[PDB]
């Protein structure tokens, strides 16, 4: 991921720039509740403008239209308005993102123009599949996917992807823009830079913190990271499958993966061959049901979790052992929380861990959190950086130009 063209190396003087951005801002009744994403794209836009771009055409998606036009539910129009204010420059909103009219509008704009197109996911051709009003799944048509892609391509002379968080999908706006230079925007640059260091030449010790719910769909994540790390914390719902299998721990109604259980000793067996020191939790915050407002308890591996109750967070002794690993690390990658941090009662392990990760950063650790000024890098894509850590090829990253 080191050798990708980035916007700062791209010539844009007098060029029309088609820029895929992340403008999926949280919305309430069509009013933007957090403009943080729009803000994050401004440096890229401005760089283009300050460097004499003829136009920047912004294409993005919002919400969940699933390939049906929903102008009154998932329009990008409000975003154009916020952007005009963020930039101090007019932004031209277009009511579609492809077709003859949009093409004429973009063919030779007034120099310095900024254009936001309507939501890409109004077209089944963006994602290559969608639904209808009755919610019956539909397929896109090959011929029409290709035409969509040719129309997006008509809108600029160079292309910028600053949408890392979509870069794991082979979508028209990710892989379909056929233009001679395809660069990463400034957000995408930071992602490639941080993840490339971590995967290629991490500082050492390299600690991976892996949490979340399910073991089953994290087998490649763990496997690949076992090729690379020196230490790994296993937390979140995952840990109960490991502790049941490895230690015969009573887990109560804690998440258990019957399929995952059968490979636990396989993974530990790989950790051992490789010299990766595994830190599992040793105590827990328990809950009488899966609910924000459940009664809370405490349990250790020795006592086990009681009948009826589940571990939704690690305890104080687990936080210390976690901290011991964090204290050793010179490079940390963290993917997935270590308890149900959405619920205040089950959020202490995660907050405490984050406090340790923040101090580590102060002392000079390189710290990467998956999908904020106190860590080295917060990733802008959750699914994408997970597939990265799995060692997969990301279509939108792979499509960018080399050198
Ligand atoms: N001990 C636990 N038991 C059940 N769920 C948990 C536990 N710890 C964390 N989780 C939940 O798992 C979710 C993250 O799981 P993950 O596999 O990363 O799914 P996602 O696909 O949402 O990222 C979080 O929302 C968190 O609340």
Swiss-Prot record:
(2R)-3-phosphoglycerate binds at residues 21-24, 36-37, 60-61, 63-64, 120-121, 168-169. Coiled coil: none annotated. SUPFAM superfamilies: Phosphoglycerate kinase (SSF53748). ATP binds at residues 213, 218, 237, 311, 342. AMP binds at residues 213-214, 218, 237, 311, 342. Mainly expressed in spermatogonia. Localized on the principle piece in the sperm (at protein level). Expression significantly decreased in the testis of elderly men. It comes from the Eukaryota. CDD domains: Phosphoglycerate_kinase (cd00318). It catalyses: (2R)-3-phosphoglycerate + ATP = (2R)-3-phospho-glyceroyl phosphate + ADP; L-seryl-[protein] + ATP = O-phospho-L-seryl-[protein] + ADP + H(+). Its EC number is 2.7.11.1, 2.7.2.3. Changing residue 86 to P: In PGK1D; with congenital non-spherocytic anemia; variant Matsue. CDP binds at residues 212, 217, 236, 336, 338, 341. Pfam families: PGK. The modification N6-malonyllysine is found at residue 129. The modification N6-succinyllysine is found at residues 4, 46, 189. The modification N6-acetyllysine is found at residues 9, 46, 73, 84, 89, 95, 129, 144, 197, 265, 289, 359. One of its GO terms (molecular function) is protein-disulfide reductase [NAD(P)H] activity. It is an enzyme of class 2 (transferase). One of its GO terms (biological process) is cellular response to hypoxia. Catalyzes one of the two ATP producing reactions in the glycolytic pathway via the reversible conversion of 1,3-diphosphoglycerate to 3-phosphoglycerate. Both L- and D- forms of purine and pyrimidine nucleotides can be used as substrates, but the activity is much lower on pyrimidines. In addition to its role as a glycolytic enzyme, it seems that PGK1 acts as a polymerase alpha cofactor protein (primer recognition protein). Monomer. Interacts with kinase MAPK1/ERK2; the interaction is direct, occurs under hypoxic conditions, and promotes its interaction with PIN1. Interacts with peptidyl-prolyl cis-trans isomerase PIN1; the interaction is direct, occurs under hypoxic conditions, and targets the protein to the mitochondrion by promoting interactions with the TOM complex. Interacts with mitochondrial circRNA mcPGK1 (via its 2nd stem-loop); the interaction is direct and targets the protein to the mitochondrion by promoting interactions with the TOM complex. Dysregulated mitochondrial targeting of PGK1 may contribute to the elevation of aerobic glycolysis seen in tumor cells, a phenomenon known as the Warburg effect. PANTHER family: PHOSPHOGLYCERATE KINASE, PHOSPHOGLYCERATE KINASE 1. Belongs to the phosphoglycerate kinase family. HAMAP family: Phosphoglyc_kinase (MF_00145). This is Phosphoglycerate kinase 1. It comes from Homo sapiens.
